[PDB]
């Protein structure tokens, strides 16, 4: 197999990015091409599809001789990456053998070897879906709304109308409603083709947003009785996309 | 029943204030008048009386049509209020029905409904007591002294003399003494009619001071073999008062 | 027995210093002389020798009438010292009786009495050893390397050569190597008489470095199949020295 070397400036930031996907994933196949790094995986229950796209442009050095796929234990990967410091340079290197060499370069050079595994590749595509509502909002609003809703229920209803986006949860001894309009600082964009209603499991939503930053811009696309697509951008050009099955 | 709307700027600060009283209280009757909000309660053991007085002046909007009392599960109340952000506006609103509508207004509008309960009203008054000692001290000194004393004992002796205030705890394998004079930065005022000695349970004192700030000014009034009155001010005009039975 | 009074400006810093030695020690004899305070102890397994030397020069007041030794329960000592604030003045005073009076002077005067104990004095000396390698490195590199290695193994190999210092750990499903050269910011000095290799137990190393600061300069001296000497300086003139038996 052909070697590669991939270098990312800011090892802690890369660890943070991986930790977001790791919240739902135990293991994943990483497709390494000359265009960038991609990872498409499902959580163990098959409710959430994760797609992480890291173009060559976000890496300070990118040397990929031929496209290849590697399998990674995501919890082992995250344990090693968590050792990286904020100003470390991260080097991901594969030689001829079946392990990933992970180097942090900073005040010292620290090199871990991570055994590569084989990950069953389900044929996963990200199909186009007839979403009728798009919402762009601040991470902090999304994160707090999911925490708010968890105080009352295990499911969160998403309601998009022309002028307002509402997330509402109801339980026996409580009720919570989070409302956004374009007058609100938390709502950056709202495009609604038609009144759209769908509900989503809070346990999955919590794991999806756990690593998202309070100042991150999160795009939500959904439809009535349809999955929720949730994405935010990494270093402008990278993209993390979640696709979440509705609660029906 | 008549509706009301009460608005407080700084929702996290209001949550912090409630959490102080919640440390000893499971449930409480809130008396809502045109003059302000008051709450008088005892801890489950009847050792501590809590009195919280929030005048209309500390609220940015105060619309109370007729005086009424509402009962609140304090742990449920604190769980909701803990969701408020530091720059959220807090709205407490009662309509015709038997629930409190709690709204945080900031980057988004988030509305919780809290069921109102019935709280048995003991006839609680705050009687005047012939205290012989008044002490004003920095919260940090009070908080640290109670923590210091807990290393050695379950009771803390308070000793006030003309020129010095001493808090002393004694155990078998330790002893601790905290001493203040007006030369000390921690002691803001000391008024002693006569030498005054009393002891107080550390477990109650710890719960009383847990939420007090290190820079808060705490007034202590006590007497020999008499209860301890402990108060500090909220937004200059609000007042939290504890009355603690002596250890005899 | 003769009284003494020893005063240290910055009580939290003194607590931090004691906590470093306390990580391996349950009890210790402190030798109090006119020259300073010294403490030599072994951990319960006799794998680590600790030597703490605090010259009179680091104390703001130092009144020792005659040399004497006192025994101290280190966990009780650390519990009291942890109550000191960063800007507290610390007073250690012994009167005629068999207890240490520990005073924090700041916003208030707080005085603890700590019973002195008798500590069996093993005849402990710090012998000169024919070390062949000296390494000066930043605490953060040492601390992170030990944490890195603990991800893969229970022992850490130290390898010093003319131009590079390597710490390497190997396990079944992982491997880690931390490498320093004088080009690296983490390596302040490297003096190697000959190629030097030795291994050390990570559990002991972790407890030795737990309290060391990320910006502290740590000197390591070791030899092949020889103990590791690890020291760093306290207020320029104080010294904490660990001597760690090799893993053979």
**Considering CB atoms only, which of C147, C173, C177 is closest to A111?**
C177
Show residues of chain B in contact with A184, CB under 8 Å: 107-109
Show residues of chain C in contact with B138, CB under 8 Å: 107
Token couple for B149: 């004393």
Minimal C-alpha gap between C83 and chain B (Å): 7
Tokens 């509008």 belong to: B109
Nearest CA in chain C to B185: C107
**Considering CB atoms only, which of C152, C173, C184 is closest to A107?**
C184
Whether residue C109 and residue B180 make contact (CB cut-off 8 A), yes or no, is yes
Whether residue B185 and residue C106 make contact (CB cut-off 8 A), yes or no, is yes
Rounded CA-CA distance C194/B7 in Å is 75
Token couple for C131: 């070390």
Whether residue C175 and residue A112 make contact (CB cut-off 8 A), yes or no, is yes
**Contact indicator for C36, C55 with CB cutoff of 8 Å:** yes
Task: Identify the CA nearest to A197 among candidates A231, A155, A232.
Answer: A155
Q: Which residues on adjacent β-strands are paired with residue A222? A: A133
Whether residue A113 and residue C179 make contact (CB cut-off 8 A), yes or no, is no
Token couple for C99: 């207890």
DSSP string for B182-233: TTSTTEEEEEESS-EEEEEEHHHHHHHHTTS-TT-EEEEEE-TTSPEEEEEE
Rounded CA-CA distance C220/B68 in Å is 73
Between A and B, how many residue pairs show a Cβ–Cβ distance under 8 A?
53
Minimal C-alpha gap between C17 and chain B (Å): 20
Which chains have 3+ CB pairs within 8 A of B? A, C
Token couple for C225: 């199949």
Local structure of B60: helix, strand or coil = coil
Per DSSP, helices labelled H in chain B are 11-22, 74-81, 139-150, 202-209
List all residues 6 or more positions away from A123 whose beta carbon is below 8 Å from its beta carbon: none
**Considering CB atoms only, which of B152, B174, B180 is closest to C108?**
B180
Rounded CA-CA distance A100/A113 in Å is 6
Minimal C-alpha gap between C101 and chain A (Å): 43
Task: Identify the CA nearest to A14 among candidates A92, A70, A111.
Answer: A92
Tokens 């930065």 belong to: B185
Rounded CA-CA distance A108/A93 in Å is 18
**Considering CB atoms only, which of C83, C107, C115 is closest to B138?**
C107
Angle (CA) C13-B187-B135 rounded to 5° is: 135
Rounded CA-CA distance C41/B193 in Å is 53
Instruction: Give how far Cα A238 sits from Cα of A9, A36, A84, A231, B244, Å.
Output: 14, 9, 20, 10, 60
CB atoms near residue B59 (< 10 Å): 22
Minimal C-alpha gap between C125 and chain B (Å): 32
Name the interface residues of A facing B (CB cutoff 8 Å).
Answer: 138, 140-141, 144-145, 147-148, 151-152, 173-180, 184-187
**Contact indicator for B204, B151 with CB cutoff of 8 Å:** no
Task: Identify the CA nearest to C79 among candidates B142, B176, B211, B154.
Answer: B176
The side-by-side arrangement of strands in the sheet containing A61-64 is A61-64, A4-9, A89-94, A99-105, A109-115, C174-181, C164-171, C155-160, C196-201
DSSP structural state of residue A88 = P
Minimal C-alpha gap between B62 and chain A (Å): 23
Rounded CA-CA distance C126/C156 in Å is 24
Task: Identify the CA nearest to C136 among candidates C62, C210, C53, C219.
Answer: C219
Whether residue A112 and residue C185 make contact (CB cut-off 8 A), yes or no, is no
**Contact indicator for B133, C68 with CB cutoff of 8 Å:** no
Nearest CA in chain A to B81: A148
Whether residue B147 and residue C83 make contact (CB cut-off 8 A), yes or no, is yes
DSSP E strands in chain C: the ranges are 4-9, 27-32, 36-42, 48-55, 61-64, 68-73, 89-94, 99-105, 109-115, 133-138, 155-160, 164-171, 174-181, 187-192, 196-201, 217-222, 228-234, 238-244
Show residues of chain B in contact with C85, CB under 8 Å: 144
CB atoms near residue C66 (< 10 Å): 11
Local structure of C2: helix, strand or coil = coil
Show residues of chain B in contact with A138, CB under 8 Å: 107
Rounded CA-CA distance B230/B202 in Å is 14
Which backbone phi and psi does A45 adopt, to 5 degrees? Answer: -85, -5
Name the interface residues of C facing B (CB cutoff 8 Å).
Answer: 76, 79-80, 83, 85, 106-115
């Amino acid at each position: 197999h052909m070697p590669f070397e991939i270098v990312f400036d800011g090892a802690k930031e890369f660890a943070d990015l991986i930790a977001t996907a790791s919240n739902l994933i135990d293991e994943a196949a990483f497709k390494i091409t000359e265009e960038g790094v991609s990872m498409r995986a499902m959580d163990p229950s098959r409710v959430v599809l994760i797609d992480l796209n890291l173009p060559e442009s976000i890496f300070s050095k990118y040397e990929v001789e031929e496209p290849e796929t590697i399998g990674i234990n995501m919890d082992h990967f995250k344990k090693i990456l968590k050792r990286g410091k904020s100003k470390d340079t991260l080097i991901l290197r594969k030689g001829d053998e079946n392990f990933l060499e992970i180097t942090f370069e900073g005040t010292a050079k620290r090199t871990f070897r991570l055994p590569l595994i084989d990950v069953e590749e389900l044929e996963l595509e990200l199909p186009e879906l007839p979403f009728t509502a798009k919402v762009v909002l601040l991470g902090e609003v999304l994160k707090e709304a999911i925490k708010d809703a968890s105080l009352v229920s295990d499911s969160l209803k998403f309601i998009a109308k022309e002028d307002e986006f509402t997330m509402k949860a109801e339980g026996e001894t409580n009720e919570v409603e989070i409302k956004l309009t374009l007058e609100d600082e938390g709502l950056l964009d709202l495009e609604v083709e038609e009144e759209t209603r769908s509900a989503y499991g809070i346990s999955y939503l919590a794991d999806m947003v756990k690593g998202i930053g309070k100042a991150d811009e999160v795009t939500l696309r959904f439809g009535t009785e349809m999955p929720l697509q949730m994405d935010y951008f990494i270093r402008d050009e990278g993209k993390l996309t979640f696709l979440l099955a509705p609660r029906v």
